[PDB]
């Protein structure tokens, strides 16, 4: 399996209610390991996974100074974009930012990403080759020029291709207990008779990690995709995940349908019929 | 370990 460390920053303005609320959270793969909350007491970046309390104060001071930097950038940017878009300081506006880095099974750098968003829509984003930007608007061009002039791309790449994947290796190596595990799904199929004619076949997958899993139905062997339902993978709470897929079938034909489960924690895919 | 490279708009 491959791995990735990502950081998600959100900043929502509050007119008349003081400074905008800032929240930053960090993930390694699907496990959250740090957070910050401008309304919280400590005013300091907290841990959220045991293997990151391993760090001394040299580190926690840093991610606190750095996250306060992100915070006071988004603080200004909200006022900047409000002017960019000629909006009044009466509505609440939302700035988001995302960056991280992926590695292969050999933990070598694979791809990076950094990208910005205003009020739920794209704004600016590093190009996949990490050497130039894609502005989504006429306004974002002004940002693009500003950042082209400061060589920001040449420095986020340096962080993305270097420091980012090193600390990901550190993070994976420190928490090889948790981040490198592979919990396979505890699969089963339930059967709910709707009427005298149709019957619902629900195919569950509970308590697994990582969460990239694939559920599929197959009538007579070839893929069935009509009359199906597929809920979004959901967090259990204990750091595992749950997901199911249903299919509605005519009475008596239950055995024609087979659910197929694919996971990195599975040698070869599981297949389930009704019984 | 997040980046230190944050700039304005």
């Amino acid at each position, epitope marked *: 399996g491959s791995h990735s460390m990502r950081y998600f920053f959100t900043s929502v303005s509050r007119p008349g209610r003081g400074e905008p609320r800032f929240i930053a959270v960090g993930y390694v793969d699907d496990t959250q390991f740090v957070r910050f909350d401008s309304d919280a007491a400590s005013q300091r970046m907290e841990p959220r996974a045991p293997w990151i309390e391993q760090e001394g104060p040299e580190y926690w001071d840093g991610e606190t100074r750095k996250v306060k*930097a992100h915070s006071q950038t988004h603080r*200004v940017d909200l006022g900047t974009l409000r002017g960019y878009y000629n909006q009044s300081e009466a509505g609440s506006h939302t700035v988001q930012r995302m960056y991280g880095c992926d590695v292969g099974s050999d933990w070598r750098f694979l791809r990076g990403y950094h990208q910005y968003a205003y009020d739920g829509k794209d704004y600016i984003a590093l190009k996949e080759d990490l050497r130039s930007w894609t502005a989504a608007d006429m306004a974002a061009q002004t940002t693009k020029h*500003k950042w082209e*002039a400061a*060589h920001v791309a040449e420095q986020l790449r340096a962080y993305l291709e270097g420091t980012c994947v090193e600390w990901l290796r550190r993070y994976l190596e420190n928490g090889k207990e948790t981040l490198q595990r592979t919990d396979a799904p505890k699969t089963h199929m339930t059967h709910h008779a709707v009427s005298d004619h149709e019957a619902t076949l629900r195919c569950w997958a509970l308590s697994f990690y990582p969460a990239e899993i694939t559920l599929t139905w197959q009538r007579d062997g070839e893929d069935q995709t009509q009359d199906t339902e597929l809920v979004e993978t959901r967090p259990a709470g204990d750091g595992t995940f749950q997901k199911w897929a249903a299919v509605v079938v005519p009475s008596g034909q239950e055995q024609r349908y087979t659910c197929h489960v694919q996971h990195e924690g599975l040698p070869k895919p599981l297949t389930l019929r009704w019984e | 370990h997040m980046t230190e490279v944050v700039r304005h708009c």
Partner: T-cell receptor, first 109, second 115 residues
Framework: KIEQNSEALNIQEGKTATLTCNYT??????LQWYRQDPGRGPVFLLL?????KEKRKERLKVTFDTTLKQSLFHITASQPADSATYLC??????????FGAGTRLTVKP | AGVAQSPRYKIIEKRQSVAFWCNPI?????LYWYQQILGQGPKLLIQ????????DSQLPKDRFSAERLKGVDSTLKIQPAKLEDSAVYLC?????????????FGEGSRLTVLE
């Protein structure tokens, strides 16, 4: 986290002046050098990015060592008109330009 | 064509008020107030980007206050001035930090606070 310059230098004409600027616990991506005269008012001189090394203008020779955490400023073929105090300045993200103290140069004729 | 600062020199007694006006380079979004004591280098007081505040955690709000209102010129007040406040007060305007992020300083406003 500090920013240390020199402490009161002076040289003869013709000889080239070297001013040093060391910083600790930082990471800038941009260095700048300024010249302030008695009578107030810093005036900008040179501006060097981290991936570059050595930038020259006229008689000015400035260097930026990312890993040494140090910048070196050179006036070559020094004139007595060059005598003033000289300021180092770092650019910390997002837009915090912090200044060192002065190194006062006096080029004796 | 120049960063304007008023007044050249200003004498005030202790507990008094004093206000320095500065007009930046035309079109510069970022304006800084810096304090420079006898021999030290400039230490930032407050920093604007347009009409908003970027950094003023260094600004002793006991006495100092400053705002840009229009996003253009700004004024820096001292109510009241302590005897430790005698210094040069520098105004500067810059564009985006980058290859053209140079700072543009005014002539300075020499404050002298007396017994």
């Amino acid at each position: 986290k500090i920013e240390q310059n020199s402490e009161a230098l002076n040289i003869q004409e013709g000889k080239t002046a070297t001013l040093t600027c060391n910083y600790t616990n930082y990471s800038p991506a941009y260095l700048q050098w300024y010249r302030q005269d008695p009578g107030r008012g810093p005036v900008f001189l040179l501006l060097i990015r981290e991936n570059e090394k050595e930038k020259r203008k006229e008689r000015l020779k400035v260097t930026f060592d990312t890993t040494l955490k140090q910048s070196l400023f050179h006036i070559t073929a020094s004139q007595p008109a060059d005598s003033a105090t000289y300021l180092c300045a770092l650019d910390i993200y997002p837009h915090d330009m912090r200044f060192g103290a002065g190194t006062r140069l006096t080029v004796k004729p | 064509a120049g960063v304007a600062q008023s007044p050249r020199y200003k004498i005030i007694e202790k507990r008094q008020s004093v206000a320095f006006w500065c007009n930046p380079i035309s079109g510069h979004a970022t304006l800084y107030w810096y304090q420079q004591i006898l021999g030290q280098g400039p230490k930032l007081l407050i920093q604007f980007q347009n009409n908003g505040v970027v950094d003023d955690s260094q600004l002793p709000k006991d006495r100092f206050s400053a705002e840009r209102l229009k996003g253009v010129d700004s004024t820096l007040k001292i109510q009241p001035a302590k005897l430790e406040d005698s210094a040069v007060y520098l105004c500067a305007s810059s564009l985006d930090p980058g290859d053209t992020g140079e700072l543009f300083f005014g002539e300075g406003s020499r404050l002298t606070v007396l017994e």
